[PDB]
Amino acid sequence: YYNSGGNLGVLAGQSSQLNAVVDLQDRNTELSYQMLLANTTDRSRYFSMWN
Amino acid sequence: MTFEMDPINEPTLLYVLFEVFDVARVHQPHRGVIEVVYLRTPFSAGNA
Amino acid sequence: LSAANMLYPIPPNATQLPIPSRNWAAFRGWSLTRLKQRETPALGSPFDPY
Amino acid sequence: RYSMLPPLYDTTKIYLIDNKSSDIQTLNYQNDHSDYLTTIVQNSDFTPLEASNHSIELDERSRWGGNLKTILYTNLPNITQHMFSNSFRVKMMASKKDGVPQYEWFPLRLPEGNFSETMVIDLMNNAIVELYLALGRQEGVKEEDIGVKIDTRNFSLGYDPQTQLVTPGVYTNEAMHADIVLLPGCAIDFTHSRLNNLLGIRKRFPYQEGFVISYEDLKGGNIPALMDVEEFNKSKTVRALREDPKGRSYHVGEDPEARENETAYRSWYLAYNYGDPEKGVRATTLLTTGDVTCGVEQIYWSLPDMALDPVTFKASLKTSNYPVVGTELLPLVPRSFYNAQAVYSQWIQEKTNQTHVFNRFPENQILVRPPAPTITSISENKPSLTDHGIVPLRNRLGGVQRVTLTDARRRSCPYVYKSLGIVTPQVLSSR
Numbered sequence: 001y002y003n004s005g006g007n008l009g010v011l012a013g014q015s016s017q018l019n020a021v022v023d024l025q026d027r028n029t030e031l032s033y034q035m036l037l038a039n040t041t042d043r044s045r046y047f048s049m050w051n
Numbered sequence: 052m053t054f055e056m057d058p059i060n061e062p063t064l065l066y067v068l069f070e071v072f073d074v075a076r077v078h079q080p081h082r083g084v085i086e087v088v089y090l091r092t093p094f095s096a097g098n099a
Numbered sequence: 100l101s102a103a104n105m106l107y108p109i110p111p112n113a114t115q116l117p118i119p120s121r122n123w124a125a126f127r128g129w130s131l132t133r134l135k136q137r138e139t140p141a142l143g144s145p146f147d148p149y
Numbered sequence: 150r151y152s153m154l155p156p157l158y159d160t161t162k163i164y165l166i167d168n169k170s171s172d173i174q175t176l177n178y179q180n181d182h183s184d185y186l187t188t189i190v191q192n193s194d195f196t197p198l199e200a201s202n203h204s205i206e207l208d209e210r211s212r213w214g215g216n217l218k219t220i221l222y223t224n225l226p227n228i229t230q231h232m233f234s235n236s237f238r239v240k241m242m243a244s245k246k247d248g249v250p251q252y253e254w255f256p257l258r259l260p261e262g263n264f265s266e267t268m269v270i271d272l273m274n275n276a277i278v279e280l281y282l283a284l285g286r287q288e289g290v291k292e293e294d295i296g297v298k299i300d301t302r303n304f305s306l307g308y309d310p311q312t313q314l315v316t317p318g319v320y321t322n323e324a325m326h327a328d329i330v331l332l333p334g335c336a337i338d339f340t341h342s343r344l345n346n347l348l349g350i351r352k353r354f355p356y357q358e359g360f361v362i363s364y365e366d367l368k369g370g371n372i373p374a375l376m377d378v379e380e381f382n383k384s385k386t387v388r389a390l391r392e393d394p395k396g397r398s399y400h401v402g403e404d405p406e407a408r409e410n411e412t413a414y415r416s417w418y419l420a421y422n423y424g425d426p427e428k429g430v431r432a433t434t435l436l437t438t439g440d441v442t443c444g445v446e447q448i449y450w451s452l453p454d455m456a457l458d459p460v461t462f463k464a465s466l467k468t469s470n471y472p473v474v475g476t477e478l479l480p481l482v483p484r485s486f487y488n489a490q491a492v493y494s495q496w497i498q499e500k501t502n503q504t505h506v507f508n509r510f511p512e513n514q515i516l517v518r519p520p521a522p523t524i525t526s527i528s529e530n531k532p533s534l535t536d537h538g539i540v541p542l543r544n545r546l547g548g549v550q551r552v553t554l555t556d557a558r559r560r561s562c563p564y565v566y567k568s569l570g571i572v573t574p575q576v577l578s579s580r
Contacts, residue, residue, distance in 0.1 A: 005186060005201060005549050006145045006176045010466050013083035019092070020077070020085040023525030024202035025143040027073065029160060032100035054116045056133065058111070059149040062107040064139055068130035072104055089202075093515045094103040096133040096203010096548050098193025123153060143175025 002029040070096060102130060109133070150206035158439060161241060163189050163205065165213075165452070165552055165570040172197030174550070182568055183561040185569040186466055191545070203547040205470045207574075212450050215574035216539040219450065220531035221554075222567035225447060227264035227441060231563065234443055235259045237273065238338030241296040244288035247572050252296070252334050264528055266347060266441050267521050270299045270327060271507040273344070274519075278509065283334065293397050294511070296335035299348070301327045302517045304416055305423060308373045312386050313410040318378030319487070320514050324522035327361070330372075330515070332400070336363035343443040362381035362430075364510065369429060370420030374399060375514060376485075394512045397519045414515060425533075441443035441526050442481045449555040450537070452570075457541040469559045475537040491521040532567065544572055 001007040005027045012019045023029075037043055054065055075089040107118055141147045150156045169187040175198065177185035192199040207213055228234045237393035240254045243499060257276035263269070277297055281290070301324035327348045329337055339345035339360035351451045352360060357410040387406045391398055400413040411510065420430040451471040462472035495518065499505055508518040552570065556562050 001145075004143055004145065005141065006179075006464075011085070011462065013085050014463075015082075016084045016086070017458060018086070019464070020087040022075075022089050024091075024096075026094070026103050026105075026202055028093075028100060028102075028104045035100060040082070052118050054118070054131075056116065057114045058114055059109075061111055062136035063136045063137060064136055065107045065109055066105070066132045067105040067118070067119070068100075069105065069122075070102045070130055072127070072148035073580075079120045081329055091103070092119050093122040093126045094202070095198030097190070097195060098120055098122075099190060099192030099199055141175070144178030146179060 003027050101127070108136070108137070152203045159575055161574055163546070163572045163574065164191070165189055165572070166251060167549055167552070173177040173549070180561070181563060183563060184519045184551065184563040186549050186551055188548060189550050200508060200548045202312065203548050204447040205541060205548070207546065209544065211576050211579045212541060212544070213574040214539050214577045215572045216447060217450075217475065217537040217540055217570055217572050218535070219537065219570040220478075220532065220534060220567060221448075221477065221480055221565070222530070223562070223564045224530050224566050225479070225481060225562070225564035227580070228269065229564075230367060232343060232443065233341060234343050234356060237342040238340075239277070239297045240335045240337075241277065242290045242294060242332070242335065245291035245294065246324050252545060254338065265440070265525055266303075266327070266439050268300070268521070269344070269347060269441075270519055273299050274408060291518075294332060294400060295330040297325060297337060297517060298516060299519065300330055301325065301420075301522055302355050303418060304372045305419055305472050311456055312376065313373065313387055314376040315373050316376050316384070318376050318390070320375070322520055323491075326418060326436065326522075327519075329339055330417070331364040331367060331415050333413050336361065336366075342536070346437075346443050347439060348575050349437045349439045351431055351437050353435055354433070365417055367415035367417065367420045367430060370416050370418075370426040371402075372416050372419065372515070374401065374410055393514075394579055397510075397513050397516075399515065405537040418566070429464055439526065440555045441483060441528055445478060445558045447476050447478045449556065449559075450475050450477065450559075451553045452550060454549075454551050455543055455552075455572075457543065459540075468553065468555070468561065470548070471553050471555060472554070474540050477533065477535045477537075480533040481530050482531045484524045486525045486527070487524055488523065491523050491525075495521050520540075541577070542572075561576065 001009065002038050003023055005023065005025060011020050016034050049050050069094055071091055072093045077085055078086040079087070080086065107116065109116055141149070165187050167182060167185070168181070168546070170185040173186055173188060185254060188198060190203070225232070236256055236258055238254050240252050243253050257280065258271075259269075259272050259276060259545070263272060277295065281295060285295070286292070289372065298312040298385050302320060302322070304320055305323045307315040309316050314463045328350070329348065332494065339362075340358060345351070347362055364422060377385060377388050377390045379387065389401065389406065389410055401409065401543070402411055402413055403409045417430065421434070421436055422431065451469055451473050456472070456474045458472050459474060462471055464472070499508060505511065510516040552568060554562055554568060
């Protein structure tokens with residue numbers, strides 16, 4: 001799940017209790033990640049680990 | 052904005068992308084304490 | 100990516116498509132394309148029945 | 150700060166409506182008014198849903214903490230699978246051929262809807278009958294020895310301390326309080342039922358799970374047999390009534406009258422304040438008011454993405470452990486009536502309706518229809534307007550709040566029709 005307030009991921013310190021992950025269904029992580037890879041590496045090779 | 056496009060025999064969508072600055076600072080003062088501050092400008096929190 | 104994702108419906112056979120919105124500041128630029136409704140799952144909700 | 154517009158000073162209002170869930174079409178596309186997400190923005194020109202990223206800022210220097218005057222309004226039926234009021238176990242006879250009987254516990258189910266304390270009792274016995282009309286009459290057991298039967302009237306008002314029989318020849322037709330008649334080797338289970346409180350039967354020590362009440366426990370509460378009226382010319386008296394129209398023996402303990410005149414029908418109401426108050430039933434139970442609502446169970450409220458963790462509560466993401474902000478009592482009320490028609494309307498209702506469903510045995514003085522008690526109480530969903538105390542707020546309230554309404558067992562209550570809150574934040578103390 002990404003960009004979904006319905007199932008927003010949590011990542012905060014037990015003592016803090018204040019979630020550090022603030023997502024908005026307006027953003028698009030999925031696509032963002034894609035383009036990112038095509039700019040740092042050769043998006044033609046394959047890598048099973050990350051499928 | 053006014054987009055003129057070719058007609059298609061099926062429902063479509065106009066995917067727009069208002070390139071902005073989606074940045075966030077992470078501050079860790081003490082052990083087991085994460086304080087973050089997001090800021091996407093323009094379009095801070097929707098438009099109204 | 101750094102950009103706000105917007106989605107406006109385009110009725111079948113439609114040609115013109117206006118979109119009103121206003122920015123109080125200055126961004127970076129525009130970027131756009133076209134997608135098919137059937138191939139675009141309605142996000143935000145934990146499940147799309149259609 | 151409202152991110153845009155101009156910021157406002159102290160004494161502001163942030164409303165959390167249920168009329169906003171339809172517009173958020175993307176978040177509550179699975180949950181119904183129990184844990185939906187709302188936009189506490191309300192700008193008025195930015196289309197339905199928007200401002201998901203925008204946050205309603207509050208200063209770093211001082212923390213707020215406003216009231217919370219919510220407006221709840223449910224519509225929960227009297228009986229439903231949710232509150233565990235539809236089912237209720239009860240060991241009844243299964244077969245009896247060649248003196249080869251048997252008893253086995255069977256879970257019963259009641260339809261959703263029907264209310265009224267009297268109507269529910271007739272339904273509890275109606276379930277007893279349908280069980281017999283599927284397993285009973287096909288195997289061996291007669292219509293006479295039907296185990297378990299809820300009543301309401303006192304079976305010892307006409308009893309005389311000499312003869313030991315109900316001199317009227319008929320049990321007094323006037324309900325007092327509901328109970329549970331039992332036959333040899335048969336009881337009712339109420340470990341997983343709230344129908345027990347409805348009858349007006351609570352344990353002195355509710356903290357101990359297991360509300361079993363067998364026939365063996367109802368010692369010293371035998372129902373006094375009727376007197377043979379048609380055979381009273383000068384002598385007879387001692388001779389109790391055995392049969393009647395259609396011929397249905399009352400199941401006497403034996404032929405004698407000494408230590409016997411009694412039948413094999415243990416009563417709960419007789420065991421209470423007529424038994425021996427030292428080792429009887431009156432040691433672990435208690436004669437309480439009926440109360441249709443079954444219990445004064447109080448719901449929980451919470452708003453994780455806005456109100457601070459109340460003292461010892463901890464942050465997490467699950468609808469079964471949200472940080473409660475304040476508790477309210479469920480908006481279900483009792484509505485006292487008064488039907489003088491009762492008992493007299495019973496004699497007429499048998500004609501209003503086409504078929505005697507409840508009153509299948511209009512002959513037997515024990516397996517009849519329970520006399521309709523005076524002052525019927527019905528549930529009435531009243532829209533409450535509570536007054537919650539001051540609650541601290543976050544450092545930066547979210548755009549899309551999460552209004553949750555937890556129950557007693559920590560879970561959604563699919564009977565919420567209205568659920569809105571108003572918050573009026575104000576400064577408390579600086580750092």
